[PDB]
Structure formats: C-alpha cells, structure tokens
C-alpha cells in the first residue's frame, strides 16, 4: 500500500504537477537572458510553484524499502541511489539542455564523442551554473546554497 | 598575537615525567627480568606500556617539541643578534 500510495498518488500527482510546473518553467524560460527577472510577479509565481512542488516532493512518504540483503560474501547491496521525490523542477531546469544534447549529439556515442560531451557539460556548466543559481535560487523556499548547489 | 610558549617549564615537567617514566620502566624491567617466573610476563612489565605508553610518548613528544620550539627561538635570537651586530 505504501508503494501504491507512492505511485498512484505521490508519483501520479507528482508527475501531473511536475508536467504543470515544467510547463510553467518552459513558459518562463527561466534559464535565458530573455527571462524577465524584473518580473518579480512572475519570479514570485515561479518561486511559489517551486516551493509548493518541492514541498509536495518532501511529501514523498519514504518507501520502507526492506533494507534486506545483509550478507558478507559479496552483496554490497547499496542501491539507495538516493531516490529523492521527483524534482521535475530540478529535472526540467536542464530539459532544454537535454534537448540540446540529444539533438546536437544525436549520433551514437564514440570514445571521442565522450570528451565532446564532457567539454559540452563543462561549457554549459560554466555558462549556466551561476546563471541558474541567480535565477532559481530561492532562499525563501528553504533553498540554501548547499541544497541548491548539490 | 605573538604566541608566547616559554617551553622551558613544560620541558622541565616533561623531563620530570620522563625520568619518572624511565625509573618506572627500570623498576619494571627489573621486576620482569629479575622476574623469577621465566615463563610469565609480569603484569607490571605489560602494565608499564599498558598504562604509561601513551603518557611516555606524549611527554617525550612534548619534550622534543618544546626543545625544538626553544631551539628555534634560540636560532631566531641568534640570527637576530648576528644581523643586529
């Protein structure tokens, strides 16, 4: 019943509300110079939507995943993956980058293409890390520098 | 804030504990070797470095650090005096 709650309710509602919030984010084009940061009204709407969606996320009632497979030989069962409540706010943030990567690097991955990907991440990171920090960082949403950064 | 150490008295206390350690060890190995039980190690022998090993090492380390801080102060005073001359 916990997993049913986490899918049909947490995951389903979370997916709808995240489609909605990602819709609002792409409608805002937050990570652009075109984004009207002076639109403190729209900044507040997106900040409140991030607040609400992140709170709803924190409402992920942790699946009491059976912390089983305690052995010695070679289980090393560490599959936590730190599965967090769906943060399609955080996911949609880079969805434009996902499109740019999928289209720009649509060909199959080659060994050299790996370093191409890497430098692409490096440059996108350089140009957008603190840009997106400026845009999306909302200390009022309980979003501290470590939280937002990580 | 200039760190004043006067490692002298700490060196004195460390030498105090050091000679104490040394005589305790001396009496301990005396009781051990002079231990008439050639097949049993005395609890005094074991207990010396079951009880004073860390104290001995920290005291010796403090002694050397104090002497080295003092001799660094000393070469500093020497250099400052020679440059002053």
């Amino acid at each position: 019943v916990t997993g049913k709650y986490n899918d049909v309710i947490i995951q389903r509602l979370a997916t709808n509300w995240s489609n909605t919030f990602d819709q609002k984010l792409l409608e805002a084009q937050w990570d652009t110079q075109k984004f009207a940061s002076t639109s403190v009204g729209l900044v507040k709407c997106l900040r409140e939507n991030s607040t609400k969606l992140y709170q709803l996320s924190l409402l992920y009632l942790p699946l009491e995943e059976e912390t089983q497979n305690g052995d010695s030989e070679r289980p090393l069962s560490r599959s936590n993956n730190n599965q967090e409540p769906v943060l399609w706010n955080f996911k949609s943030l880079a969805n434009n980058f996902n499109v740019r990567f999928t289209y720009h690097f649509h060909a199959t991955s080659s060994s050299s293409k790996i370093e191409t990907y890497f430098q692409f991440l490096n440059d996108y990171l350089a140009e957008n890390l603190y840009k997106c920090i400026n845009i999306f960082h909302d200390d009022c949403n309980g979003l501290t520098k470590p939280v937002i950064h990580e | 804030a200039e760190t004043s150490n006067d490692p002298f008295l700490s060196y004195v206390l460390s030498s105090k504990q050091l000679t104490n350690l040394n005589r305790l060890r001396r009496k301990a190995v005396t009781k051990q070797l002079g231990s008439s039980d050639d097949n049993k190690v005395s609890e005094e022998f074991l207990r010396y470095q079951h009880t004073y090993q860390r104290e001995a090492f920290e005291y010796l380390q403090t002694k050397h650090d104090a002497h080295k801080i003092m001799e660094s102060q000393y070469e500093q005073y020497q250099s400052s005096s020679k440059t002053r001359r």
């Binding site: 900044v43 | 040394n22 010396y48 090993q53 090492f57 380390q61 080295k68």
Partner: protein
C-alpha cells in the same frame, strides 16, 4: 666512536621527532584557514612521509639488529620480538631464557640495554600509532579542508551572487 645500535636508535628517533614536529606543523598550517590571496606544501608532506617510511624501515631494521646483537652478546638470554598482529595491542618482548648466575655488572648492563630497547620498542609502537594517527589526521583534515574550501568557495560565490543581484527591488 663505535656507534652503538641504541645510539643510532636515539639519533634516528630524534630525527623522527624532528619530522613529527615538522609534519604536525604542516597539519596545523593547513588548520589555519589560509586562502591563496599549498601544492608544494602538500608535495613536501609526501616527501617527508616517504622520509618517515624510509627512516621507519631503518628504525625497525637497526632495532632488529640491536635485538640480534643483544641475543648474541649474552648466551643465557633468549629474547623474541613478536610484532603485535593488532593495532590496539603492543608488541611483545618475551625473554625466554636467562641463567641467574651471570655477572652482576654485566647483569645490570643487560638490564639497562633491555630497558633502553623496551623503551625503544614501545616508543616505536606509539610512534607507529602516532604516524597512523597523524596520517589519518592529515586525510581527515583533507576531507574536512576540501569541504571547508568547498564551503569557503560557496560562501564567497554566495556573497558574490548576493551582491550581484537577487531581485533587490522589493
């Protein structure tokens, strides 16, 4: 000047303490919160470490040598240095054989030598413990200092961020 093995031991120990004071100074240097406003200091730490290991090999070597020298000096004595297979346990010096008819002066000389070598083996046990402690200290300080440099870069970038613009029109 025949340099007794204990003399080599004390000279090497004195050098080892020099190095301990030095590397502890390096640790407390990196425990000062210093910004580049470190690399060759780290390199010097590695060099001093490899020095610690060279000298510690020399130390245990001359230590074993002194043990052998003691064993072959006195016939009746059977000493055996049993290296402790566990950190929490000291090394062991089981005096296995000793005939109580040995000369009293030579007896006390052996006493003093045993005294010095026991002091040395225990101080060396505590020294290996201490270098393990200080390398774990250095690595813990690395984990804490990379994290503190993370937090310092985060705080500097954060105040830079904050002074740039954060919607200060409200």
């Amino acid at each position: 000047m025949v340099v007794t093995f204990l003399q080599d031991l004390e000279v090497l120990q004195d050098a080892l303490l020099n190095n301990l004071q030095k590397l502890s100074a390096i640790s407390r240097r990196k425990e000062s919160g210093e910004s580049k406003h470190d690399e060759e200091e780290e390199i010097e730490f590695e060099d001093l470490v490899n020095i610690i290991e060279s000298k510690v090999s020399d130390f245990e070597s001359v230590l074993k040598c002194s043990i052998v020298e003691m064993t072959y000096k006195y016939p009746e004595l059977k000493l055996q240095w049993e290296k402790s297979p566990r950190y929490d346990q000291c090394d062991k010096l089981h005096i296995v054989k000793l005939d109580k008819q040995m000369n009293e002066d030579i007896y006390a000389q052996l006493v003093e030598e045993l005294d010095f070598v026991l002091q040395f083996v225990d101080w060396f046990y505590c020294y290996r413990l201490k270098v393990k402690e200080i390398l774990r200290q250095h690595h813990k300080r690395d984990l804490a200092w990379n994290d503190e440099k993370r937090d310092r870069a985060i705080k500097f970038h954060a105040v830079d961020y904050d002074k740039l613009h954060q919607g200060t029109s409200s």
